[PDB]
Every structure is written in C-alpha cells, then in structure tokens.
Amino acid sequence: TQQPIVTGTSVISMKYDNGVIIAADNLGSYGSLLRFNGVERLIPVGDNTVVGISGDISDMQHIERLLKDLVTENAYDNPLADAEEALEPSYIFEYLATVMYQRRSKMNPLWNAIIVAGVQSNGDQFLRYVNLLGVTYSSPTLATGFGAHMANPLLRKVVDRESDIPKTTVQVAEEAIVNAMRVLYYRDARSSRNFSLAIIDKNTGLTFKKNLQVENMKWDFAKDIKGYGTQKI
Amino acid sequence: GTGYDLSNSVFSPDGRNFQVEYAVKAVENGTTSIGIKCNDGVVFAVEKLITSKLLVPQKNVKIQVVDRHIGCVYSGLIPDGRHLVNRGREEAASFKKLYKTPIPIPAFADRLGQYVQAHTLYNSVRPFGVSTIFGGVDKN
C-alpha cells in the first residue's frame, strides 16, 4: 500500500484507418505544485509500439526500465529480433497487464493508468488500457483520468463504433487529439500546455512529435465578464 | 600417491588442479573460435562444423549477445558456454539496475572470471568446459 507523490495527468488515444494516435502532456505534478515540465510520459518500444503512462512518475520510470529490459531480453539468442520475432504491441501489453495485476494482488500496486498503442505485424490496430487494479479493456478511443471524462466524449464524436475506424483519416484523427489537449488545458488544473504526440501507422511507421503547444485559445470573452452577479463594472 | 585428479578442488603434489586441466582438454577438442580487436571495436568469429547436409544453414547460432554491446563466443562444451552467458546476462542486468550505465567490459570480464573461478573451489561442482572469447565497446 502506497500513495502517489509525483503524478502525470491524462493520456488520451484513438485509432484511425491505418493505425493509432496517442498523446500526453509533459507535466510532473507534486500535489498542487506543477513541479516538473520536462517529463516524457510516452514511451516508444521498438518502431511499432508507444506506451503512455499516467499517475506515479517513479512507478512510470520503473515501467520504463522494465520495457528497456524486455527489448534486451527479446534480442537474446534471437536472430529475428528485428523481423518475425520482434516485440508486438500485444506482447508488451500482456506483460504489463500481468505485472499490474500481480502487484495489486500483493497489495503493493504500481500507481498508474497505462494505454498501450501500436500496430500489429498483420497491420491491425492495437489499443488497450490497464491500470493499478489490473483492469483491462479495449475501445476505439481510450483515455485516462480527466481524459476519460472530457476527451472521450469529443473523440467518440469522430469514432463512435468499430465501423467508423476505416472512415477516419490521420488528419481528422490528429485534429481531434490536438483539440482534446486544448480542452484538457482549459479545465484540468493539473495539466500542461506543452505535450508530446505519437502516431503509429502501418505504412509510414512510428512518428514521434515533441514540444507541441496548445494554440488557438479563446480567452477574449473574459474581459466582458465582471463580478459574480450584480456588479456592472 | 595417486587419485588427485578424481576430485575437483583437490590440489595435486605439484600445486595443480587436474580436473580444471581436464576441462581444458574438452576445449582443445572443440571447435576453433577467434577474436580481433580493431581501432574502435572488436570482431568475433566462429567455425561451424557441418556434420550433415541436413543441418539448416544460418540457424544454429553459436555467438551470443550479452546486454546490447557485449558479444560472446566459446569453444568446447557448447551447453557450458550457454550457462556462462546466462549468468553473464544476469550479471549485466544487475549492474544496469543499480548503476544505470551499461556494464564496462573490464567489469564484465571480472564478473565471469569470479564465477568460473568459483567452480574450481568445490568438489560438488564441475569446472567449465569452455574457453570464452568476449568483448565490446564501453566508456573508454
């Protein structure tokens, strides 16, 4: 039994016609204090998988170390480590899902909410969630923390079900993610303007974007709002 | 008298460990392997005796990787070499877990050295039947 000290907020994700898009902001919150701003919360494993973690940062760094060891372990006595016997997104998730559930069963959990995004060897999109309880679920759109409440409703407008997946292009899907990050910066008190975005495609591969900022913000209407009821000036 | 070669950790009258020298004979019988140090790295190479046309080419890989920067090749009892590499991989993971930086080659050499030396201290364990050529590139 523990408590989260340094925390990361929402990790939002969705799947489009050719792959998946995942994003998370670069903040490391210390309670109410927005302490660290150079924190990468998206962990790329190989060239076909990106792992997005929210919650405890020290536990995130442990998971980050486990993923690096998995790459090293998979390459041992394996001549096809970069070909047929490379790490699939399904292998990476199932390992983490086993670890997450084992830790909660020992009453010492990794205080995290994880989304594994990637494209399988056959071309299929992979997007599955796992948390500190070991609860696993798949959905066309997946989001942690505040993203589940705010980003999910916006992303489900683009993709409501499985039939909407092949109808959604990369440009439309990314636009929905960038918009969701703006909304999260509006209403989440533990959010950052700076964020990272990762695109895993079955054709163009892994595209990792760093130092993205929330732009085109509406604030002009604030000058017209004065007082809390009866005040005119 | 005689019988000093029957047990492992027993010293013979000339101050020798015969069971270790008997393990060297298993290495001498084995396949030839080499290592060449160049100006910025190392090159390992091994012979692979084709016993029959039934052996699938480019499949029975003898050279093993430790961590991501160390390569290992050995001569003699192949299973004994694998046991040493398995330990080496555990020792490399233990170093990286605590010290963050990947294990230096002189550091890795001692870790294998102490482990093989340990198998010459007891009569309950057999000496390794392999001579391992290994190396890589580190900090310096």
From Swiss-Prot, chain A:
Name the UniProt key words of this record, in alphabetical order. Answer: Cytoplasm, Nucleus, Proteasome
For this protein, the record's Pfam families field holds:
Proteasome
Entry's Gene Ontology cellular component terms:
cytosol; nucleus; proteasome complex; proteasome core complex, beta-subunit complex; proteasome storage granule
The entry's localization annotation reads: Cytoplasm; Nucleus
Mind telling me which InterPro entries this protein's record contains? Ntn_hydrolases_N, Proteasome_beta4, Proteasome_bsu_CS, Proteasome_sua/b, Proteasome_suB-type
Query: Quick check: keyword Nucleus in the entry?
Result: yes
Gene Ontology annotations of biological process type: proteasomal ubiquitin-independent protein catabolic process; proteasome assembly; proteasome-mediated ubiquitin-dependent protein catabolic process
Keyword set includes Nucleus: yes
Job of this protein: Non-catalytic component of the proteasome which degrades poly-ubiquitinated proteins in the cytoplasm and in the nucleus. It is essential for the regulated turnover of proteins and for the removal of misfolded proteins. The proteasome is a multicatalytic proteinase complex that is characterized by its ability to cleave peptides with Arg, Phe, Tyr, Leu, and Glu adjacent to the leaving group at neutral or slightly basic pH. It has an ATP-dependent proteolytic activity. PRE3 and PRE4 are necessary for the peptidyl-glutamyl-peptide-hydrolyzing activity.
Question: Beyond the main fields, what else does the record say?
Answer: Present with 16900 molecules/cell in log phase SD medium.
Family to which the UniProt record says this protein belongs = Belongs to the peptidase T1B family.
* Subunit (UniProt): The 26S proteasome consists of a 20S proteasome core and two 19S regulatory subunits. The 20S proteasome core is composed of 28 subunits that are arranged in four stacked rings, resulting in a barrel-shaped structure. The two end rings are each formed by seven alpha subunits, and the two central rings are each formed by seven beta subunits. The catalytic chamber with the active sites is on the inside of the barrel. Interacts with CIC1.
| Name assigned to this protein | Proteasome subunit beta type-7
UniProtKB/Swiss-Prot annotation, chain B:
Post-translational modification remark: The alpha and beta forms are probably products of the same gene with different post-translational modifications.
Cellular localisation? Cytoplasm; Nucleus
**Superkingdom, natural source:** Eukaryota
**Transmembrane stretches, by residue range?**
none
State its role.
The proteasome degrades poly-ubiquitinated proteins in the cytoplasm and in the nucleus. It is essential for the regulated turnover of proteins and for the removal of misfolded proteins. The proteasome is a multicatalytic proteinase complex that is characterized by its ability to cleave peptides with Arg, Phe, Tyr, Leu, and Glu adjacent to the leaving group at neutral or slightly basic pH. It has an ATP-dependent proteolytic activity.
Assembly and binders:
The 26S proteasome consists of a 20S proteasome core and two 19S regulatory subunits. The 20S proteasome core is composed of 28 subunits that are arranged in four stacked rings, resulting in a barrel-shaped structure. The two end rings are each formed by seven alpha subunits, and the two central rings are each formed by seven beta subunits. The catalytic chamber with the active sites is on the inside of the barrel.
Q: Which family does the record claim for this protein? A: Belongs to the peptidase T1A family.
The miscellaneous annotation reads: Present with 12000 molecules/cell in log phase SD medium.
This protein's name: Probable proteasome subunit alpha type-7
Species name: Saccharomyces cerevisiae (strain ATCC 204508 / S288c) (Baker's yeast)
Q: Which residues of the full protein are shown?
A: 5 to 144 of 288
